[PDB]
């Protein structure tokens, strides 16, 4: 909790793909660290840090600097299926038909040229 | 003057104490009450200019509001290096076809 | 305005508690009222200025002090089970207007033993296809059952934002066993949404329940988890389950894309082969 | 009434307020003075343009108005409500526009076809 | 000294004009307040009548005082279902004494919205996971119809509640009943209260149309980029296929 | 309904490049 | 400093807590206790591994933390946020992964083309 | 929609390859 620092929370659900993190530090300076390295400076009028679409699968270590000695790193890990293919018999059947007719056209072509 | 508009469930409406005067833009549709005007879906980019008088202390008052929604349902992501990648691929492909018709000729 | 804390509180018989009320408009008059269900509204100690105090009409079991006009605390040195009620803080100016400003209110409960309290269990039910086929509208219902006490707040969230339109909540909870006391409460809420909005897979619907319970300093020795003040939520994705949607589009286009680079590598490899034969003939 | 001229070039947003000839101008957004100071390089004010850099959809979308300089907030009577989404190197193309490149790509290829065949 | 309100409860259809009276036993007062509570959630007041004022008006609310007659009235014009709340009457003594207000018993008001197109029906919600209960919903019933509790302790029926949908400006009434054990087919659940005979009971068979589903389709930027990737891959595929065919013809020549 | 540039008109556009082209060279054997 | 180790296999998801070696390790999920024992057959615990079987995104996506026995989980130096929609036997198309299936195709094709060439 | 798109694409492709074989074998 707050008394155990852990100052970084995540705003996640959003009608677009953006993933948002919240640092509850005082509004005099906000700086963001990714794997312990300077990655960005956030101004007081800004309140959120954007990692882009969740479809990119944001997985990394983040922490924010307030007035006292950083914040406890949070290991955020996203594994979305922008790339999961559901192996239903229709899909393997279609892929099978596709590549077998492909190999058929190569066979006909190579038999023609040779 | 503040013309309040609300964004309930992917629809955008214009709310005023009185009737809505329409200036050029998306006309939209009117609800059961004239005082509220519907602008349709949010992701259809509703753009227009509308007018409405207030009430109580404001009356009589003229008010004009401009609505400009710019959603990226028709946008794509490509850095300049990626772009240069596609034009490079098409030019080498076209030169490849040119070489092929050269061999044919 | 008038601000009083906390919203809800659970106490053990014999514990002590203090209620905080503050105002920032330099109101001279402050008062406290307790409201019991269906017999009347009653008055507790009041102060018209700093350093003075007159007893109310139910003065026993409640205690106040006035050291600063900006704050008015109410203290319960010893909690009795009969003191379970709803409390309000009021403040006003003197003579000028006679207006009255009422606080948001505080709900307090005193129990013999803390073993009886329970956290709510939240469930959400998706609309019937018959309703969307007939009225072209989808209704979401969220159930919050078997908790004690009723220090519960319920809200709906769509795409990470709270919604205050098209939502109905039962003003009074329903007891599981109305024959005897105590009993665990059940609560229900309804949300109705146009069929087009409900059937969008991107639309995420969330039913949040905020429960006020025991604090970290409260002693717990039961064989179950300590019912600390917590939030219980239920999630739901929009769905259609009859027709084509974006999720089918996404997987279809992705499988199509995948098939295209095997075909592309297929075509490039074949093109490499024939061109390799061609330039070998050209060079030779 | 002359409409606000808005331009988007990636995450950079430019606002134009041609409702006055100029010589004095001031902006306001969600009841606070925006664009009046140089101390922030993320935003800037031009002779007739207001420049925003890495525009953010969620917390920078709202009401915008020109005062202009010397005026008061309440006397304004023509407001703009803007809420737009944008990404770095995100441009706008329509269905008819993206259909143009496909045809000319075939059209240029026809140009190559006719002349190499002559050789 | 004492405050009495008449009546204590009221039920009226929407759009009607309402008359509410408050009474006091002492005319030596300087205050008058009218509060709103629904059902708790603090007390909200939009009214103020002074001893030197006869009538006060704010919004759609009228108020009058008659200290000589010891009467106070509140007038509601074109009552709406949003006015369904508990209304309080408060007074304060004129003398500079303890300044203690004397609140009345309170008056309860329920306003029934006027449904334009009744369509009573009972729908069954599919049971969610991690739950052993079954829920059915009875909705779009006319305001003159009204429900009552079940005849058994294992069946729980809630009271009817009004819903407002600002997007479609619609008002509706609905009730929810759930039970845990045995044979809870809601063709029999709503039994203790008489319901109109034309109430719609849908068959368990389900049907729907893809046309309505297509209306909810939407687009994203990543999908657009993937689609342009598709179009590009087709273009290169046609080009390389043309070159391949040309090479087959050349080598077969 | 909002296709953006996911419009199906693109889906049946490129197959035209072989559709109206195919319907023309079919005249070779007639 | 040492990050969490996350492993995935179809509907079965197993986590690893490499920190706090030796001492007994406990777990929490959305500020509620979670572990092995016999309360549920779909969830099991190892010496330093938490195993989740038949995963579901709706209720199992959230905060997770590993803490040693006795020490308060809130005083733990680290936190984890996890979301993933699980799919049974749905293998994924990572950018480096998709490159592999291309190369294996010339391997299988490169065989059958020469025999018909040698035909 | 898209799957039917590719089915039309494949149908035109087989028609085209058959006709190409046709005039290739007829002429020379
Ligand atoms: C449309 O009509 C509504 C209903 O009359 C208007 O809303 C009302 O606006 C006034 C201000 O013009 C609000 O008064 C408020 O009072 C206190 C003063 O301390 C404070 O909260 C605010 O500063 C404000 O002055 C009033 O509450 C509000 N509602 C009602 C029921 O009267 C509205 O202004 C009209 N116009 C538009 C453009 O919406
Ligand atoms: C909304 O607000 C306007 C502003 O007062 C309401 O009054 C209309 O105001 C216009 C502009 O001043 C009037 O037009 C003018 O009328 C006279 C006679 O022609 C003259 O001064 C000008 O040449 C000009 O035409 C208009 O007559 C006046 N309308 C009324 C009914 O008083 C307007 O009515 C409001 N709109 C709605 C739809 O309620
Ligand atoms: C909280 O209110 C309580 C009353 O509920 C106050 O505490 C009680 O105050 C009385 C005096 O007001 C204390 O002593 C009394 O005085 C004599 C001593 O012989 C005699 O009349 C009574 O027998 C009685 O003892 C009394 O001890 C005390 N409470 C109890 C439980 O006996 C108190 O003033 C308030 N606390 C504050 C203001 O901090
Ligand atoms: C908030 O921090 C930012 C950087 O995160 C400070 O701005 C820069 O600070 C660096 C380091 O001292 C300087 O080299 C730059 O010249 C500063 N740039 C600007 C544009 O000021 C910023 O000063 C901090 N804010 C406050 C109020 O001290
Ligand atoms: C509330 O007050 C009104 C206004 O006084 C009452 O209406 C009067 O009722 C009496 C008794 O029937 C009639 O003699 C009067 O003619 C009515 N009008 C007036 C202006 O006095 C009304 O009856 C009261 N309502 C209740 C429920 O007590
Ligand atoms: C242009 C020439 C090479 C013919 C086109 C290739 C054919 C065989 C390919 C191209 C696109 C492919 C389709 C793309 C997507 C899907 C959806 C999936 O759920 C089942 C398979 C199915 C339906 C594929 C079947 C095979 C397919 C039709
Ligand atoms: C776009 C990608 C996937 C497809 C590539 C198209 C290739 C494989 C096509 C285009 C032209 C085709 C050839 C056209 C003519 C002939 C002569 C005929 O007597 C046998 C078939 C044969 C030899 C075809 C084989 C397949 C072929 C070489
Ligand atoms: C942060 O860390 C150190 C660690 O010793 C602490 O003493 C100090 O007060 C904190 N704040 C700073 C450096 O501003
Ligand atoms: C309501 O109050 C107004 C205040 O102007 C007064 O004129 C009117 O007579 C009152 N009564 C009604 C029924 O409108
Ligand atoms: C329900 O309806 C009946 C019949 O119209 C009516 O008499 C009764 O007052 C209503 N309310 C209750 C609580 O029974
Ligand atoms: C629900 O019904 C089951 C089966 O009869 C029973 O065992 C269980 O105790 C019931 N649950 C409650 C909360 O009453
Ligand atoms: C419901 O009421 C009817 C009469 O209306 C009665 O015959 C029947 O037994 C009751 N119960 C069920 C389960 O139908």
Q: Could you tell me the residue ranges of all domains in chain E?
A: 3-112, 121-207
Whether D93 sits inside 8 A of B75 (CB atoms) is yes
**Of residues G70, G55, G52, the one with CA closest to residue G16:** G52
Let me know: does D62 contact D27? Beta carbons within 8 Å. Answer: no
Does chain D reach chain C with at least 3 CB pairs under 8 Å? no
Ligand 6 in contact with A94 (CB < 6 A)? yes
**B-chain residues within 8 Å CB-CB of F10?**
none
- Comparing CA positions, the residue from G51, G5, G48, G52 lying closest to residue G25 is G48
Residues in B touching D82 (Cβ below 8 Å): 68-70
Contact criterion met (CB below 8 Å) for E18 and E76: yes
DSSP letter at C127? P
Q: Which residues pair with E109 in a beta bridge?
A: E10
> By C-alpha distance, which of C25, C60, C67 is closest to C45?
C60
Q: Which ligand is closest in space to the CA of residue E70?
A: 5
Contact E96, E29 (CB under 8 A): no
**How far, in Å, from the CA of B55 to the mean position of ligand 1?**
10
Report the alpha-carbon distance of residue B46 to residue B38 in Å, rounded: 10
Looking at chain C, which subunits does it touch, using at least 3 CB pairs closer than 8 Å as the criterion?
A: A, B, E, G, H
What is the radius of gyration, based on Cα positions, of chain G?
A: 21
**Residue C134 contacts residue C246 (beta carbons within 8 Å):** no
Phi-psi map region of G42: left, alpha, beta (phi>0 left; psi -120 to 50 alpha): alpha
CB D14 within 8 A of CB D49: yes
Contact between G93 and C254 using a beta-carbon 8 Å cutoff: yes
Residue identifier of the C-alpha nearest atom 16 of ligand 7: H21
Which ligand 7 atom sits nearest the alpha carbon of residue H24?
17
**A68 close to ligand 8 (CB < 6 Angstrom):** yes
Pairing of strands E134-139, A18-23: unpaired
Instruction: Note the Cα B103 to chain centre separation in Å.
Output: 51
CB contacts of B74 in chain F (<8 Å) are: 4-5
CA–CA dist G49, H23 (Å, integer): 68
Q: Specify the number of domains making up chain A.
A: 2
Angle at E249 between CA E247 and CA E251, to 5 degrees: 65
CB atoms < 10 A from the CB of E235, how many? Answer: 19
Distance between CA D6 and CA B25 in Å, rounded?
15
Alpha carbon distances (Å) from C281 to B96, C284, D117: 17, 5, 21
- Residues in chain B closer than 8 A to D91 (CB atoms): 75-76
Rg value, chain E, Cα: 32
Per-residue CA distances from G93 to B15, E228, E230, G97, G99 (Å):
48, 19, 16, 6, 9
Indicate whether A40 and A10 sit together in one domain: yes
Query: Does this chain's domain C2-112 share its CATH topology with C115-237?
Result: yes
Name residue B77's beta-bridge partners: D90
* Residue ranges making up the domain that contains D84: 1-119
Gap between the Cα atoms of E70 and E47, Å rounded:
18
Helix %, strand %, coil % of chain H (to 5): 95, 0, 5
Closest ligand to residue A91's CA: 6
Question: Is some CB atom of chain B closer than 8 A to the CB atom of D97?
Answer: no
Task: Please tell me the total number of residues recorded for chain C in this structure.
Answer: 284
Residue whose structure tokens are 């299988």: G108
Q: How far apart are CA D8 and CA B69, in angstroms?
A: 12
Ligand nearest to the CA of D39: 4
What kind of experiment solved this structure? cryo-EM
Q: Do A99 and C202 touch (CB under 8 A)?
A: no
* Residue reference for tokens 């049907």: E207
Q: G95-118 vs C246-283: helix axis angle to the nearest 10? A: 50
**CA–CA separation, E32 and E55 (whole Å):** 11
Count other Cβ atoms within 10 Å, centred on residue D33.
12
**CB half-sphere exposure, E144, CA atoms < 13 A:** 2
CATH 2.60.40.10 fits E121-207, yes or no: yes
d(CA C79, CA C110): 7
User: How many CB atoms are located within 10 Å of the residue E247 CB?
Assistant: 22
Measured between alpha carbons, how far is residue E62 from residues E82, E89, E104, E113 in Å? Answer: 17, 14, 19, 22
Q: What's the total number of domains in chain D?
A: 1
Residue C255: name the closest of A89, A56, A57, A83 by CA: A83
Domain pair E3-112 / E121-207, same fold: yes
Q: Which residues of D touch A14 (CB under 8 A)?
A: 58
Three-state SS string over D65-117 comes to EECCCCCCCCCCCEEEEEEECCCCCEEECCHHHHHHHHHHHHHHHHHHHHHHC
Give the tokens for residue D107.
């059209």
Q: Beta partners for C19?
A: C74
Q: Breaks in chain G at C–N > 2.5 Å: after which residues?
A: none
C-alpha E107: how far from chain center: 21
How many residues are there in chain H?
28
Give the DSSP per-residue string, E208-248.
--HHHHHTT----HHHHHHHHHHHHHHHHHHHHHHHHHHHH
Angle at E226 between CA E222 and CA E228, to 5 degrees: 115
Of the candidates E180, E140, E144, E176, the residue with the CA atom closest to the CA atom of residue E158: E176
The residues near D35 (Cβ < 8 Å, ≥ 6 apart) are D26, D27, D43, D44, D45, D50
Within chain B, what is the greatest distance between any pair of CA atoms? 85
Strands E3-6 and E18-24: antiparallel
Instruction: Convert A23-83 into a string of H (helix), E (strand) and C (coil).
Output: ECCCCCCEEEEECCEEEEEECCCCCEEEEEEHHHCCCEEEEEECCCCCCCCEEEEEECCCC
Name, in order, each residue with C-beta under 8 angstroms of C90's C-beta and a sequence gap of 6 or more. Answer: C2, C29, C30, C31, C32, C33, C100, C101, C102, C103
- The number of residues in chain G equals 119
Computed on alpha carbons and rounded to an integer, the radius of gyration of chain A in Å comes to 24
Range of the domain at A112: 84-114
- φ/ψ of C190, rounded to 5, equals -125, 135
Cβ contacts of C190 within 8 Å, gap of 6 or more: C139, C140, C141, C142, C167, C168, C169, E161, E163, E174, E176
Pairing mode of beta strands E61-66, E55-58? antiparallel
Which long-range contacts does B22-30 make (Cβ < 8 Å, 24+ apart)?
Answer: B22/B48, B22/B50, B22/B51, B23/B48, B23/B49, B23/B50, B23/B51, B23/B64, B23/D1, B24/B48, B24/B49, B25/B49, B25/B50, B25/B67
Q: Is B2 in the pocket of ligand 1 (CB under 6 A)?
A: yes
Ligand 12 atom 6, closest CA: E191
Question: Are A72 and A102 in a shared domain?
Answer: no
CB E244 within 8 A of CB C267: yes
For this experimental structure, what is the resolution in angstroms? Answer: 3.3
Q: Identify the CATH class of E3-112.
A: mainly beta
* Sequence ranges of the domains in chain C: 2-112, 115-237, 245-284
DSSP characters for E77-138? Answer: SS--GGG-SEEEEE--BSSSS---------EEEEEE---SS---EEEEEPPPTT---EEEEE
> What number does the ligand 1 atom closest to the CA of B3 have?
38
Contact C32, C56 (CB under 8 A): yes
Indicate the fold that domain C115-237 takes in CATH: Immunoglobulin-like (2.60.40)
- Are C and A touching by the rule of 3+ CB pairs within 8 Å? yes
> Is the peptide bond between C156 and the residue preceding it cis, with omega within 30 degrees of 0?
no
Q: Do the chains H and B touch each other, judged by at least 3 C-beta pairs below 8 angstroms?
A: no
**What's the CA-to-centroid distance between B27 and ligand 2, angstroms?**
22
Instruction: Give the whole-angstrom CA distance, residue E47 versus residue E76.
Output: 13
Distance of CA D31 to the CA centre of its chain: 21
DSSP D59: T
Domain chopping of chain H, boundaries: 1-28
Second-level CATH architecture of C2-112: Sandwich (2.60)
């Amino acid at each position: 909790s707050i008394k155990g620092n852990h100052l970084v929370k995540v705003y996640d659900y959003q009608e677009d793909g953006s993933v948002l993190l919240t640092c509850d530090a005082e509004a005099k300076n906000i700086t963001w660290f990714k794997d312990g390295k300077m990655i960005g400076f956030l101004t007081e009028d800004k309140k959120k840090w954007n990692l882009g679409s969740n479809a990119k699968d944001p997985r990394g270590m983040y922490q924010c600097k307030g007035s006292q000695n950083k914040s406890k790193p949070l290991q955020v890990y996203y594994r979305m299926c922008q790339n999961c293919i559901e192996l239903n018999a229709a899909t393997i059947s279609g892929f099978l038909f596709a590549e077998i007719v492909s190999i058929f056209v190569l066979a006909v072509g190579v038999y023609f040229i040779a | 003057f503040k013309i309040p508009i609300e964004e309930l469930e992917d629809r955008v409406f214009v709310n005023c104490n009185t009737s809505i005067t329409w200036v050029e833009g998306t006309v939209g549709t009117l609800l059961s009450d004239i005082t509220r005007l519907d602008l349709g879906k949010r992701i259809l980019d509703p753009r227009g200019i509308y007018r409405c008088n207030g009430t109580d202390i404001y009356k009589d008052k003229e008010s004009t509001v401009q609505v400009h929604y710019r959603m990226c349902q028709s946008c794509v992501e490509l850095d300049p290096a990626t772009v240069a990648g596609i034009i490079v691929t098409d030019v080498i492909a076209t030169l490849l076809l040119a070489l092929g018709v050269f061999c044919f000729a | 305005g008038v601000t009083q804390t906390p919203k809800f509180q659970v106490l053990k018989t014999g514990q002590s508690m203090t209620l905080q009320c503050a105002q920032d408009m330099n109101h001279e008059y402050m008062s406290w009222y307790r409201q019991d269900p269906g017999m009347g509204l009653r008055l507790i100690h009041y102060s018209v200025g700093a350093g003075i105090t007159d007893q109310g009409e139910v003065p026993n079991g409640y205690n106040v002090s006035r050291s600063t006009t900006e704050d008015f605390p109410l203290r319960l040195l010893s909690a009795a089970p009969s003191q379970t009620s709803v409390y309000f803080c009021a403040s006003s100016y003197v003579g000028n207007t006679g207006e009255l400003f009422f606080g948001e209110g505080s709900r307090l409960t005193v129990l013999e033993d803390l073993k009886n309290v329970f956290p709510p269990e939240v469930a959400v039910f998706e609309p019937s296809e018959a309703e969307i086929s007939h009225t072209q509208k989808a209704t979401l219902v969220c159930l919050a059952t078997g908790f004690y006490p009723d220090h519960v707040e319920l809200s709906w969230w769509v795409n990470g934002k709270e919604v205050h339109s098209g939502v109905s909540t039962d003003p009074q909870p329903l007891k599981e066993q109305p024959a005897l006391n105590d009993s665990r409460y059940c609560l229900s809420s309804r949300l109705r949404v146009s069929a087009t909005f409900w059937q969008n897979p991107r639309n995420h619907f969330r039913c949040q329940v905020q429960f006020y319970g025991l604090s970290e300093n409260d002693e717990w020795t039961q064989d179950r988890a300590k019912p600390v003040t917590q939030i219980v939520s239920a999630e739901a994705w929009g769905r259609a389950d009859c027709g084509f949607t974006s999720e089918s589009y996404q997987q279809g286009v992705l499988s199509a894309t995948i098939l295209y680079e095997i075909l592309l590598g297929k075509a490039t490899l074949y093109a490499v082969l024939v061109s390799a034969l061609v330039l070998m003939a050209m060079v030779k | 009434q002359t409409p606000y001229k808005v331009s988007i070039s990636g995450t950079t947003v430019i606002l134009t307020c041609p409702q006055y000839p100029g010589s004095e101008i001031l902006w306001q957004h969600n009841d606070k003075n925006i664009g009046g100071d140089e101390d922030d390089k993320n935003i800037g004010s031009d002779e007739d343009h207001l420049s925003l850099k890495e525009f953010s959809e969620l917390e920078q979308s709202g009401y915008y108005v020109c005062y202009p300089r010397g005026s008061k907030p309440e006397d304004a009577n023509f407001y703009l409500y803007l809420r737009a989404r944008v990404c770095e190197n995100c441009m706008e193309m329509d269905v008819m526009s993206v259909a143009t490149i496909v045809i000319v790509d075939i059209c240029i290829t026809g140009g190559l076809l006719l002349l190499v065949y002559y050789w | 000294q004492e405050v009495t309100q008449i009546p204590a409860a009221l039920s009226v259809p929407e759009g009607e004009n309402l008359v509410l009276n408050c009474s006091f036993t002492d005319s030596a007062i300087y205050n008058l307040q009218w509060f709103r509570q629904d059902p708790g959630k603090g007390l909200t007041s939009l009214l103020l009548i002074q001893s030197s004022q006869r009538e006060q008006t704010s919004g759609r609310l009228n108020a009058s005082l008659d200290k000589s007659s010891g009467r106070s009235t509140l007038y509601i014009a074109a009552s709406q279902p949003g006015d369904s709340a508990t209304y309080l009457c408060a007074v304060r003594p004129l003398y500079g004494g303890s300044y203690i207000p004397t609140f009345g018993r309170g008056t309860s008001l329920i306003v029934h919205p006027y449904i334009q197109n009744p369509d009573p029906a009972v729908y069954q919600l599919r049971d969610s996971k991690s739950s052993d209960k079954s829920v059915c919903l009875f909705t779009d019933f006319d305001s003159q119809t009204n429900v009552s509790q079940s005849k058994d302790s294992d069946v729980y029926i809630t009271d009817k509640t009004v819903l407002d949908m600002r997007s479609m400006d619609f008002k509706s009434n609905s009730a929810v009943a759930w039970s845990n054990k045995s044979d809870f087919a809601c063709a029999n659940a709503f039994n203790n209260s008489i319901i109109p005979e034309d109430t719609f009971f849908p068959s368990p068979e389900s049907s729907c149309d893809v046309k309505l589903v297509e209306k909810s389709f939407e687009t994203d930027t990543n999908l657009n980029f993937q689609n342009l990737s598709v179009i590009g891959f087709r273009i290169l595929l046609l080009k390389v296929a043309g070159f391949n065919l040309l090479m087959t013809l050349r080598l077969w020549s | 309904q909002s296709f953006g540039l996911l419009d199906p008109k693109l889906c049946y556009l490129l197959d035209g490049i072989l559709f109206i082209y195919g319907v023309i060279l079919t005249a070779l054997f007639l």
